[PDB]
């Protein structure tokens, strides 16, 4: 998947 928030 994609880079998530911290």
């Amino acid at each position, epitope marked *: 998947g994609t880079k998530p*928030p911290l």
Partner: antibody
Amino acid sequence: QVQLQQSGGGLVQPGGSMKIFCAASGFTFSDAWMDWVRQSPEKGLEWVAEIRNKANNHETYYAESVKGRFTITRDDSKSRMSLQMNSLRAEDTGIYYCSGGKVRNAYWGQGTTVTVSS
Amino acid sequence: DIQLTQTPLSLPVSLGDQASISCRSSQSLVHSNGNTYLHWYLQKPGQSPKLLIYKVSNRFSGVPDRFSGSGSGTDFTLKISSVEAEDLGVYFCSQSTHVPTFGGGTKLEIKR
């Protein structure tokens, strides 16, 4: 109570521009992960664009269908975001929902319609 | 892409009975960080969508525990025990593991 109130929708010529807005209350907006999601018969529910946390530097991302035409905007001090649209197409026609929260898609507004027609 | 497919299209159910809804993803929703971003929503007539369940099985605040979600990888189910009238509407699943995509929805009809 949390409210997301969309505004600014209406009729636009193909090729034209339109800004819609979402006013938030009842939660700490700078903490909130926000989305625009549109709905149409010809496509059902469609993610359009997102704008992340202050913590996450208000990072934006756009659906590929609107990349380059649409600009998402936010003001934490005024608990408001917008979607500024250009070169609108018939296919952009739909109900545009404002959605967000600490948990993401936690809350949804009643939506505002965007109709692209001559 | 990742298409999510909902099944069945409509579901009639008598009050007090259990309803079961399925949502398959065109691929695994398991993220590189071990999390599975699979959410369920209900759109009642005339209203916008409302979060029911996030990350597979976590009830968002306010959601009655008659609503329950389970599943792994590409296979997910929403279960609604004790169906009440006010449950009718369209149930949607969406995934946000990848670029966010939504299911086609499943209409819950109340047998009368």
